[PDB]
Amino acid sequence: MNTLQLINKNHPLKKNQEPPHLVLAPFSDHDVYLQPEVAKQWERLVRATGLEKDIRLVSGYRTEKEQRRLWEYSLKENGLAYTKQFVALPGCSEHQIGLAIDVGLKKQEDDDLICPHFRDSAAADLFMQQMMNYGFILRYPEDKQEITGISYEPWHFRYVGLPHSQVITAQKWTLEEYHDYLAQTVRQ
Amino acid sequence: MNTLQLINKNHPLKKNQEPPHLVLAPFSDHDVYLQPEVAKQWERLVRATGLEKDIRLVSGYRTEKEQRRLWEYSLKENGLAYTKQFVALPGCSEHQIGLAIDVGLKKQEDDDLICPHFRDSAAADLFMQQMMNYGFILRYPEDKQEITGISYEPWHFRYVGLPHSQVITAQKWTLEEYHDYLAQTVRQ
Ligand SMILES: C[C@@H](CP(=O)(O)[C@@H](C)N)C(=O)O
Ligand SMILES: C[C@H](N)P(=O)(O)C[C@H](C)C(=O)O
Ligand SMILES: [Cl-]
Ligand SMILES: [Zn+2]
Ligand SMILES: [Zn+2]
């Protein structure tokens, strides 16, 4: 189980890839499932930031079939442009390996399917200060769209574990750039 | 597509069972998947009742592994007796075939994933007046626990389609009793 696995349009999942072990993750108002270490660190993060009343887990594990239904729904409802921007192709979603969390605010009207609100908020600010100390990175940062192939998603966090999350966040890297960095270092 | 399939402790899913067709379902704050006709009738029901801003889809299709992890979670958090009251055994949940919905109120903060709040509100009252006209039944009514093997769940609805849901609801039947009725009637 590689917590650093790069999954995107250029690196899709293999169909022989073992489905992740899963557990039900806490701090949601519905059933969300995550790889066990991810759930454990998510829980540690929420408790340590004391954000129990302020944030919630919106989305976790999705099967490929589910990712395809999500994709097809957004394509139909929101059009190809929006969908390519904000939804990963089936086979290319981190949600399919149980290492991705979508996080939202608990006091939200509007709250949308594809783009849960995790912006303009003291809680989100605190979450962004401590996330990396529990193994999470902001997967799709602003102005990295050409590197990640995905538009800015303040709600989507990827578990990579320590110290990777701290290294990545401090350098304001994407996971793509992190792999580039590691490959360049073994190359030198 | 057997919309009347009886799934419970005494009638588990087989792995003769091909997985359900699935679509992303509307009127939720996260990704919920349902069999297509279920999602369609759910959407019609919410629009007809004008409850788009009042209720939400909490849970839909759940894989067998997910049901197992949900059950294991409840065991840890709530103990065995509570879990058996409210959570179907893995392999015995209607959620695994995509014909069940858990419904909650859209305004509820820190809602319970196991037992979503769905009583003492005008929204729930109106939903209970119209659900059966769109193919849904209250799966686990309050005075039927010896028949269903499950405690009263005001939030849990099962799609059986028309006219079945109207027949079942007018008789204050369970799906168990409905099956016994159809069986008994055939022998006439
Ligand atoms: C790129 C992400 C989009 P998301 O899952 O955060 C959004 C659909 N909720 C993915 O599809 O894996
Ligand atoms: C977990 C909730 N109590 P449910 O999903 O409404 C219970 C139902 C019997 C099932 O586990 O399918
Ligand atoms: Cl399908
Ligand atoms: Zn996501
Ligand atoms: Zn249910």
UniProtKB/Swiss-Prot annotation, chains A, B:
Entry's EC annotation: 3.4.13.22, 3.4.17.-
Reactions catalysed, as given in the entry: D-alanyl-D-alanine + H2O = 2 D-alanine; UDP-N-acetyl-alpha-D-muramoyl-L-alanyl-gamma-D-glutamyl-L-lysyl-D-alanyl-D-alanine + H2O = UDP-N-acetyl-alpha-D-muramoyl-L-alanyl-gamma-D-glutamyl-L-lysyl-D-alanine + D-alanine
Primary location group: cytoplasm
Active site feature: 153
Gene Ontology MF terms in the entry: carboxypeptidase activity; metal ion binding
Residues holding Cu(2+): 95, 102, 156
Residue positions binding Zn(2+): 95, 102, 156
Top-level taxon of the source organism: Bacteria
Biological processes annotated in GO: proteolysis
Protein keywords: Antibiotic resistance, Carboxypeptidase, Cytoplasm, Disulfide bond, Hydrolase, Metal-binding, Multifunctional enzyme, Protease, Zinc
GO cellular component entries: cytoplasm
Induction field: Expression regulated by upstream promoter elements. Part of the probable VanC-type operon associated with vancomycin resistance.
Compartment(s) of residence: Cytoplasm
Residues annotated for Mg(2+) binding in this entry: 66
Annotated a dipeptide binding sites: 67, 88, 93, 95, 102, 155-156
Pfam family, one: VanY
Subunit structure as annotated in this protein's UniProt entry: Homodimer.
PANTHER family, A to Z: D-ALANYL-D-ALANINE CARBOXYPEPTIDASE, PEPTIDOGLYCAN L-ALANYL-D-GLUTAMATE ENDOPEPTIDASE CWLK
Function: Bifunctional enzyme, exhibiting dipeptidase and carboxypeptidase activities. Catalyzes hydrolysis of the D-alanyl-D-alanine dipeptide. Cleaves the C-terminal D-alanine residue of UDP-muramyl-pentapeptide[Ala] (UDP-MurNAc-L-Ala-D-Glu-L-Lys-D-Ala-D-Ala). Shows no activity against the pentapeptide with a C-terminal D-serine residue. Together with VanC/VanC1 and VanT, required for vancomycin resistance in E.gallinarum strain BM4174.
Family statement: Belongs to the peptidase M15D family.
Stored NCBIfam families: vanXY
Protein name as catalogued: Bifunctional D-Ala-D-Ala dipeptidase and D-Ala-D-Ala carboxypeptidase VanXYC
